[PDB]
Amino acid sequence: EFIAWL
Amino acid sequence: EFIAWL
């Protein structure tokens, strides 16, 4: 599982 | 920035 937030 | 890898 990958999560990115900017 | 936030990143998660599980």
Numbering used by the authors:
A (entry chain B), B (entry chain A): 1 to 6
Quote the original article.
Crystals of APRGLP1 grew only at a low pH (pH ≈ 2, T = 37 °C) where the N-terminal glutamic acid self-converted to a pyroglutamic acid (pE) via a spontaneous ring closure. To avoid this side reaction and study the effect of protection of the N-terminal, we synthesized and crystallized its N-terminally acetylated form, Ac-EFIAWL. This compound showed similar spectral properties to APRGLP1. In the structure of APRGLP1 the hydrophobic residues (Phe, Ile, Ala, Leu) form a hydrophobic core, while Trp and pGlu participate in H-bonding with each other and water molecules. A similar interface can be found in the structure of its N-acetylated form. The presence of the acetyl group and Glu instead of pGlu resulted in a lateral shift between adjacent β-sheets, allowing Glu to form H-bonds with waters located near chain termini and Trp side chains from neighboring β-sheets. The fact that this structure also belongs to class 7 suggests that the hydrophobic residues are the main determinants of the topology of the nanostructure. In the crystal structure of Ac-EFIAWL, the interaction between Phe residues from neighboring sheets is made possible by a slight shift of the sheets compared to the structure of pEFIAWL.
